[PDB]
């Protein structure tokens, strides 16, 4: 279902924005990061084996951005701020991916 | 059996990762590799219906979740607390003894 892919991918995008936009000292950070990683794992596990999705810009861009977020947290733990230039890049990839997503791309 | 093969590999990575000293330069890679194997195992078998009735699956799932929850809360260099690490390793042995017998 394409509508379901749009709903699920929008939710993940919102979680990335929520997690990345918290204050670096914020106490909810560890919880936010944990929820994001659970959302990311579910999204990947649901959609990565769907072959044709690799042809969607929305999928490639979200998959790449989630990997950028995941790689940072698995290296440094949940309260390490993502480097500012990567954070900017990730949030920009979220915007480009969401613009494709809601056009059915 | 594919499930036995995959679960043995995960057990082995848990044992390898938990046994490393905190000075080991491979710890970061080892935790990452374990996280990846753990994700692939759960994604592959949590969907399978029959397996939640298997002791090996429940015990592995539980122990991977204990490993996961620790490393999502701390960096890869933070050791799992000693008493939990020992319990995890013991559940690995229990799970493997059931796994090898088809349970």
Author numbering:
A (entry chain B): 2 to 106
B (entry chain A): 4 to 106
Please give sentences taken from the publication describing this entry:
A large number of auxiliary proteins, including Psb27, have been shown to be involved in the assembly and/or the repair cycle of PSII. An Arabidopsis mutant lacking AtPsb27 was deficient in recovery of PSII activity after photoinhibition, suggesting that AtPsb27 is required for the efficient repair of photodamaged PSII. The two Psb27 isoforms from higher plants do not contain lipobox sequences and N-terminal cysteines, and they are not membrane-anchored lipoproteins.
In this study, we resolved the crystal structure of AtPsb27 at a resolution of 1.85 Å, which is the first Psb27 structure from higher plants. To determine the structure of Psb27 from A. thaliana, its mature form (AtPsb27) was successfully over-expressed as a GST-AtPsb27 fusion protein in E. coli. AtPsb27 crystalized at a concentration of 22 mg/ml in 2.0M potassium/sodium phosphate solution at pH 7.0, and the crystals of AtPsb27 were observed after 3 days. The AtPsb27 structure reveals as a helix bundle with a relatively flat top and bottom, consisting of four long alpha helices (H1–H4) as well as a small helix between H2 and H3, designated as H*. The four alpha helices, H1–H4, span residues 3–22, 30–49, 58–76, and 85–104, respectively, and are arranged in an up-down-up-down anti-parallel fold to form the bundle body. The well-conserved P-Φ-P motif (where Φ is I, L, or V) resides in the loop H3–H4, and is exposed to the AtPsb27 surface. The small helix H* is formed by residues 52–56, and constitutes the bottom area of the AtPsb27 structure. Firstly, H1 and H4 are positioned more closely in AtPsb27 than they are in TePsb27, which makes the AtPsb27 bundle tighter than in TePsb27. In contrast, the N-terminal region of AtPsb27 consists of a stretch of negatively charged residues, which makes it unlikely for AtPsb27 to bind the membrane through its N terminus.
